[PDB]
């Protein structure tokens, strides 16, 4: 009953609700936000993660990537070519240059049409996956560098750092730069804050319909699926909404504006593109509900360096009564994507 349309919801927390992060996530899930697989959270007007973004021109983007895209009829494959390092000011000059700047347009639908029509032309540069944060160290609310969720158990118990997952990543985008369809590593949650600049548009498939998308993708790229079952985790696959609609895959879209947060939920597939020069900060996080997803996540093993997280510490601590069975490989739990996370019980009475 809580958002049975499974559409993307937007929330407006007061400063008081905003202070406790994991508690608010539990709240929006009690409101059915997780069903769409993506949700927007507009922070209270008083809140600000940083006083000014005018002192970062010398920040270096170590490995910018040029996005070469090949495809047709709504199905594409993206090849990220690493380019020489450059500073933000240099990236900005190129981003706003006449060659890569956002084309003129009226409504969003028009820009979206131009994106899908020209994505294989004039390959843009994306300052993606950059180690770092732009938050001021005194910001305690929704600080992406320290969210305080159970995902912290990984670093606290194994002392293992997985950059981008338990640490923040910055993304400097320009017109037409894209992020392919995927769910988070280990099917975790993700938080994405657009610090400044032009918008970032998103597409999302309800977690309860995720398999349908995987099925559809496997059909479009049989060779890729043959080489790796979780090939989508390679983050190279682009699929247009027209193709999603044509094959009956449910989905929704939303545009994130500067100063707004986007939360992706476990096993929630998403993809998108940047409208123009901008900067976003992202990382992963977890809740008790994620644990079962982590245990059942289909992983990529055809490549080195892929993110892998042992679920042993979570099962042992949060599901001690199921731990022995699980180790024996006999845990047959079935995930119900509609159910909110346990921490939400508080808001359901």
């Amino acid at each position: 009953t809580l958002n049975p349309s499974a559409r993307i919801m937007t929330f407006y927390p007061t400063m008081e609700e905003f202070r406790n992060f994991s508690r608010y996530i539990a709240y929006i899930e009690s409101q059915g936000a997780h069903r769409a697989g993506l949700a927007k959270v507009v922070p209270p007007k008083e809140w600000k993660p940083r006083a000014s973004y005018d002192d970062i021109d010398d920040l270096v983007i170590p490995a910018p990537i040029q996005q070469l895209v090949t495809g047709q009829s709504g199905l594409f494959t993206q090849y990220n070519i690493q380019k020489k390092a450059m500073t933000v000011r240099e990236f900005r000059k190129i981003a706003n240059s006449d060659k890569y700047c956002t084309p003129r347009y009226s409504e969003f639908e028009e820009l979206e049409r131009k994106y899908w029509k020209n994505l294989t032309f004039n390959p843009p540069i994306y300052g993606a996956d950059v180690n770092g944060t732009l938050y001021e160290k005194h910001v305690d609310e929704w600080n992406i560098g320290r969210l305080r969720t159970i995902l912290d158990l990984v670093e606290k118990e194994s002392g293992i750092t997985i950059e981008g997952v338990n640490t923040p990543y910055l993304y400097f985008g320009m017109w037409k730069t894209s992020f392919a369809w995927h769910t988070e590593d280990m099917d975790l949650y993700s938080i994405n804050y657009l610090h400044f600049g032009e918008p970032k548009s998103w597409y999302s498939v309800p977690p309860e319909h995720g398999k349908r998308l995987e099925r559809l993708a496997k059909g479009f790229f049989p060779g890729s699926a043959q080489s790796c079952e979780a090939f989508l985790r390679h983050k190279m696959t682009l699929i247009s909404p027209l193709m999603l609609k044509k094959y009956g895959i449910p989905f929704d879209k939303v545009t994130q504006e500067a100063g707004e947060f986007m939360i992706t939920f476990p096993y929630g597939y998403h993809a998108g593109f940047n409208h123009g020069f901008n900067c976003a900060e992202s990382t992963n996080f977890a809740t008790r509900r994620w644990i079962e997803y982590g245990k059942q996540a289909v992983l990529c093993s055809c490549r080195k360096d892929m993110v892998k997280i042992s679920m042993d510490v979570f099962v042992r601590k949060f599901q001690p009564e199921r731990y022995k069975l699980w180790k024996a490989g006999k845990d047959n739990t079935v995930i119900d994507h509609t159910l909110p996370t346990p921490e939400a019980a508080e808001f359901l009475k």
């Binding site: 090849y79 070519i81 990984v154 293992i160 990543y169 892998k308 042993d312």
Partner: peptide, 12 residues
């Protein structure tokens, strides 16, 4: 090892 890796995808 059981836990490790990096979020950044392999580039070309």
């Amino acid at each position: 090892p059981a836990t490790g890796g990096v979020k950044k995808p392999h580039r070309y």
